Amino acid sequence: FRKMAFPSGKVEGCMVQVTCGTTTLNGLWLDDVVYCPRHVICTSEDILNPNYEDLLIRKSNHNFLVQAGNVQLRVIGHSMQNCVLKLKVDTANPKTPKYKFVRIQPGQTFSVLACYNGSPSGVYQCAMRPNFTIKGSFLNGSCGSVGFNIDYDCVSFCYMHHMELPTGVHAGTDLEGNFYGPFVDRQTAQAAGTDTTITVNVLAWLYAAVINGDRWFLNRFTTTLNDFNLVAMKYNYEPLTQDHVDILGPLSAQTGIAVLDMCASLKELLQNGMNGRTILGSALLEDEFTPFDVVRQ
Amino acid sequence: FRKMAFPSGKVEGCMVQVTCGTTTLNGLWLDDVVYCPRHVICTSEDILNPNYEDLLIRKSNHNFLVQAGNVQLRVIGHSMQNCVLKLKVDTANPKTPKYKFVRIQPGQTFSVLACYNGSPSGVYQCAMRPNFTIKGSFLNGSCGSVGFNIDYDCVSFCYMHMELPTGVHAGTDLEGNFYGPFVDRQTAQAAGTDTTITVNVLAWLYAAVINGDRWFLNRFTTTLNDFNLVAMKYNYEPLTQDHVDILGPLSAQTGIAVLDMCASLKELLQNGMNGRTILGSALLEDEFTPFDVVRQC
Ligand SMILES: *[C@@](O)(CO)[C@H](C[C@@H]1CCNC1=O)NC(=O)[C@H](CC(C)C)NC(=O)c1cc2c(OC)cccc2[nH]1
Ligand SMILES: *[C@@](O)(CO)[C@H](C[C@@H]1CCNC1=O)NC(=O)[C@H](CC(C)C)NC(=O)c1cc2c(OC)cccc2[nH]1
């Protein structure tokens, strides 16, 4: 059982480089539109406090250099949607997949294709944290890298990368340009809200361990849903809802372990610690596998 | 630090399915050759003690069903190289990347594109253990999935996918030679006892130093032989000359001589971590290569 990303080929064919003046970043080329973070129009001075509509009206189509591989695409129009710039080009991307733009919910996972200078570099799985950060791996020039899920050849784009917080976690927007979380595309040191642990995912991951032959953390006890949630909130875990209980059904039926039985196991792990033992190779409780992630794998 | 896979698109375009009788697995289509595990030719009555040479004589080109999706590729020749079958087909794959076949050493990392019926399912990083197993995530039908590294758009294929009774996985290089002492028969096989990948732990310590976490740097050095003798008493792999040289770039970057870092690790092995952490963790990580570290740092 490993963190597994979706195959990235359908997205790789869409990554381009966008350059405005001295600033370059990545763009997403779908049909005849290139989507990229709007701060590509800011100079190192503008970015401390950018008035984006005022800066964008002063730019011309020819101010934007878009490169796909080596070939330059001609920008024939541009509009802004929240924090995302939409550059219209005279060439349709012939490798555009079936796609949708979606805004994901906290606790849901997606694959990130990290890119630099329009070139894909790496792929890995992230979860949208409850405080709307993600724990990714992004360096200078990664802005405009995207996150996505794939379901039967349809790519659902959910994330476009914008910033790294002082704590080293990351923040970005959906493909409509609205940030996840309270962040703003200005060059400032921003803190997130206090993060919490994705309870339903920890439970799904304990089920994954049982499906894979590890049972050491199980116990004879049970708990009520409310009593579990009282302990969970005390340990900065998210509440577990009845919808979460229902979503864990298949894993429960597959293993024959009642959800609230597994909740009692997690309660014990939380109150007694792991005592130096490991689960699926981890010395920490893992919360970035969803129940679907476990089933799909 | 994230386990990051290479973008998989260049390999996705090479995946096909190969069927013999009722047995379907995955194959790798490069130029006009499809490479796949030779046990596709076995029936349930052959796999226990297969005589591959006599089984292959009874096969003809028209016994092999090779499909890119649902499109059949006509087989025009067949041969066996060690544990791989090579089916010559009448169409050169237009998506063939620049590629090489490489045999990796223990400790090296690579991306696995897990595939089923020729259709890529997910991608993730693996490390070759010193006992020549990988901790993969493979189900029924995964055989023929490949592992690879990508350097300047050249794909170096290193792995073609058995699951041991312990749940780890074994396979061959693309010339059909198993990593480790395994054979392609339907038989419960055991790997040698594993060891910790020393060169990768040292890479991890360099990564910590790069990031300002350097409490473990001491005032000692060691000879390579003295370190290797200690390492073996703690179930750590001995270092080779090649290991010393691939640590060269990180040693230059930090100014910490390789043998000085060996002396720091030796102290950690003999005394333990004393409840202290390195890069946030009480456990030393051995699945990041020196290349992986320079890439994320
Ligand atoms: C982009 O790629 C910009 O094109 C860049 C991506 C990060 C660089 C290092 N790792 C990354 O993920 N994003 C930024 O540089 C953004 C730009 C904003 C959205 C206009 N800024 C930050 O991520 C940022 C600014 C500051 C800061 O200021 C002062 C202080 C502390 C942290 C910090 N992060
Ligand atoms: C390929 O899909 C087969 O074409 C399959 C992959 C494994 C299935 C479960 N996870 C995998 O990685 N491979 C096999 O089933 C191979 C086939 C051989 C090479 C002919 N066999 C095994 O992996 C195998 C057989 C036995 C066994 O016997 C008896 C006893 C214990 C373990 C075991 N593994």
Numbering used by the authors:
A (entry chain B): 3 to 299
B (entry chain A): 3 to 163, 165 to 300
Lines from the paper:
The main protease (M pro) of coronaviruses plays a key role in viral replication, thus serving as a hot target for drug design. M pro is able to process polyproteins to produce several nonstructural proteins (NSPs) necessary for viral replication. The recognition site of coronaviral M pro depends on Gln at the P1 position, and no proteases in humans share a similar cleavage site. PF-00835231 is an inhibitor designed for the main protease of SARS-CoV that emerged in 2003, but its clinical trials were suspended due to the rapid disappearance of the SARS outbreak.
We then used the co-crystallization method to determine the crystal structures of several M pro mutants of SARS-CoV-2 in complex with PF-00835231. The resolutions for these structures are 1.79 Å (M pro G15S with PF-00835231)A, 1.68 Å (M pro K90R with PF-00835231), 1.65 Å (M pro M49I with PF-00835231), 1.72 Å (M pro P132H with PF-00835231), 1.64 Å (M pro S46F with PF-00835231), 1.66 Å (M pro V186F with PF-00835231) and 1.91 Å (M pro Y54C with PF-00835231), respectively. In each of these seven complex structures, each SARS-CoV-2 M pro mutant molecule appears as a dimer form, which is also the form with enzymatic activity. Overall, each protomer of the SARS-CoV-2 M pro mutant binds to one PF-00835231 molecule. The details of the interaction between M pro M49I and PF-00835231 show that PF-00835231 interacts with several residues, including His41, Phe140, Cys145, His163, His164, Glu166, and Gln189. The results clearly showed that the ligand binding patterns are not disrupted by these mutations. The key hydrogen bond interactions between residues in wild-type M pro and PF-00835231 are consistent with the structure of wild-type M pro-PF-00835231, except Phe140, Gln189 and Thr190. The IC 50 value of PF-00835231 against SARS-CoV-2 M pro was 0.0086 μM, while the IC 50 value of PF-00835231 against SARS-CoV-2 M pro mutants, including K90R, M49I, G15S, V186F, P132H and Y54C, ranged from 1.2 to 3.7 μM.
